[PDB]
Amino acid sequence: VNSFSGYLKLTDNVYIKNADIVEEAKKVKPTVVVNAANVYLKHGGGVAGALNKATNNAMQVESDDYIATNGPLKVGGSCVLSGHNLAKHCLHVVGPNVNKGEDIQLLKSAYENFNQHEVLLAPLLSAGIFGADPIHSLRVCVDTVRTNVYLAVFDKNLYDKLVSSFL
Numbered sequence: 001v002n003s004f005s006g007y008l009k010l011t012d013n014v015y016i017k018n019a020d021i022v023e024e025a026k027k028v029k030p031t032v033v034v035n036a037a038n039v040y041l042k043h044g045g046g047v048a049g050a051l052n053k054a055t056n057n058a059m060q061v062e063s064d065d066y067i068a069t070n071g072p073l074k075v076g077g078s079c080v081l082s083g084h085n086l087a088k089h090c091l092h093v094v095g096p097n098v099n100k101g102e103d104i105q106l107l108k109s110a111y112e113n114f115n116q117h118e119v120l121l122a123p124l125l126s127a128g129i130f131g132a133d134p135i136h137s138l139r140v141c142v143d144t145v146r147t148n149v150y151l152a153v154f155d156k157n158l159y160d161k162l163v164s165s166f167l
């Protein structure tokens, strides 16, 4: 038993809710919140900009030190950093950005990072400003992630569509 409330159960291990991931993290304090990161950990907009704003830019400060030490992530890769006031940990995961021409097949590799964590609050990778089809992203998520994933979908209209078209 865990504290996520109001989710619709899609599969054995995937749940989904129309929610603001920032508000969900602050209420739930999950062990892991997933950020829709880029390779530079520049949290300017979309989910990343919202999560970072909620941390009063502490996420960005920590991220800049990470990059200065380690260099950029790989597309499809991830790193674990602090969750600040939102979660114990933040798993920064880089899905391919279609608006940068990145290979969509890397989406499966990106979701594989979730399997290193028993339970996660997460957005749909490569959705929103990353330019992928959220329905495809949901399919890859369901077919790749084996751990328990609680997906927060900000847009109500999109949430309903994802549910209604789910196979």
Ligand SMILES: O=C(N[C@H]1c2cccc(O)c2C[C@@H]1C(=O)O)c1ccc2[nH]c(CO)nc2c1
Pocket (backbone or CB within 6 Å): 020, 021, 022, 036, 045, 046, 047, 048, 050, 095, 123, 124, 125, 126, 127, 128, 129, 130, 134, 152, 153, 154, 155
């Ligand atoms: O853009 C946002 N989320 C979408 C996104 C973005 C980039 C890559 C992605 O893969 C996805 C998928 C994610 C989604 O479909 O839910 C977002 C989420 C919460 C927000 N809270 C505020 C306050 O103003 N702005 C927000 C923006």
